[PDB]
Design a protein around this nucleic acid. Structure first.
Ligand code: CAC
Ligand code: MG
Ligand code: NA
Length: 327
DNA sequence: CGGCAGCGCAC
DNA sequence: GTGCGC
DNA sequence: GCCG
């Protein structure tokens, strides 16, 4: 689906990014939705009225869209803080968001070297810093595959019936991936237990895992590892690797959630809500019970979903292949 | 206007 | 509790 | 930022 409003979506992507790095995440969200629409519009935008007919574009966005169309420029871009470029540089560090970026900028830091030399860093940020270049580049789809295989082989050594699948952008079919998320479960419903720990162990012993960002995260019955790996071989880069072990009963929803994209998940939650349901990485459930004051005082009932299709079906939706989940 | 999900971790 | 990424 |  070619974009017929490039010079517009280009200038808008700059302003969006600017708001994002300065902390205005919600406004950044709005821009990103509007920018998507502009790209997937069935043709070029020629009027303010036309612009306003596209869901996701309101008066203010139309206003900007038309300014670029007619004038070829966007004044707003000229008044963007000079700090932006640096705030982005600092936030490209895994573990450092806008607040940390702003703090470092206020302390007079300007380069990655200043950070490395005078900045106070958290354990995660330090790891993020030494792997700045590596974590910045998207890896070839092929390397993501090898990483998944490495995890799978080591997991199946403990139990051959385990099911492993790489999610994220990789499962959505992208040529390159910024990271790998390996979701692991077992069809029998309980043999996935007591796998997480010895698996990370096995992978560390063989030198595959080089750094831990979060060694273990317990979310209900889901165990998640956020770390860094590097395949054997000279010239291999370090890569962001996540490992998630979940009970089979939550495999579908976990698969759906970690395959994303983040915009897709967002739309699915919104839709669940309209049907009186909630969708999480754990399950599709009826909405929670709330008292007169309108406050969660009783979880909803989980609606069993063996496969992703079951989730789409219960939401009265046509199944969407992973490759079609960018938005 | 409030919602745009809500979680667990490191600090 | 806040900041961050999932 | 947009939406209801
Ligand atoms: C101000 As309005 C069109 O978002 O209700
Ligand atoms: Mg507001
Ligand atoms: Na960051």
């Amino acid at each position: 689906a070619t974009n017929h409003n490039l010079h517009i979506t280009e200038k808008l992507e700059v302003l969006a990014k600017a708001y994002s790095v300065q902390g205005d995440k919600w406004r950044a969200l709005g821009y990103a939705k509007a920018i998507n629409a502009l790209k997937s519009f069935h043709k070029p935008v020629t009027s303010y009225q036309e612009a306003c007919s596209i869901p996701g574009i309101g008066k203010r966005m139309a206003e900007k869209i038309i300014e670029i169309l007619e004038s070829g420029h966007l004044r707003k871009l000229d008044h963007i803080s000079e700090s932006v470029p640096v705030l982005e540089l600092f936030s490209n560090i895994w573990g450092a968001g806008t607040k940390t970026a702003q703090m470092w900028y206020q302390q007079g830091f300007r380069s990655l070297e200043d950070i490395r030399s005078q900045a106070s860093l958290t354990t995660q940020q330090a790891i993020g810093l030494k792997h700045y270049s590596d974590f910045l580049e998207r890896m070839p789809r092929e390397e993501a595959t090898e990483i998944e295989q490495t995890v799978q082989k080591a997991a199946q050594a403990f139990n051959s019936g385990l099911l492993c699948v790489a999610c994220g952008s990789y499962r959505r079919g992208k040529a390159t991936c910024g990271d790998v998320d390996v979701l692991i479960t077992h069809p029998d419903g309980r043999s996935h237990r007591g796998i997480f720990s010895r698996l990370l162990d096995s992978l560390r012993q063989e030198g595959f895992l080089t750094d831990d960002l979060v060694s273990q995260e317990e979310n209900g019955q889901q165990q998640k590892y956020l770390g860094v790996c590097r395949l054997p071989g000279p010239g291999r880069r370090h890569r962001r690797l996540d490992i998630i072990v979940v009970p089979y009963s939550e495999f579908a929803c976990a698969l759906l959630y970690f395959t994303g994209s983040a915009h897709f998940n967002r739309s699915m939650r919104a839709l669940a809500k309209t049907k009186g349901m909630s969708l999480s990485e754990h399950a599709l459930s009826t909405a929670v019970v709330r008292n007169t004051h309108g406050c969660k005082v009783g979880p909803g009932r989980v609606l069993p979903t063996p496969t992703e299709k079951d989730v789409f079906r219960l939401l009265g939706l046509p199944y969407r292949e992973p490759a079609e989940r960018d938005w």
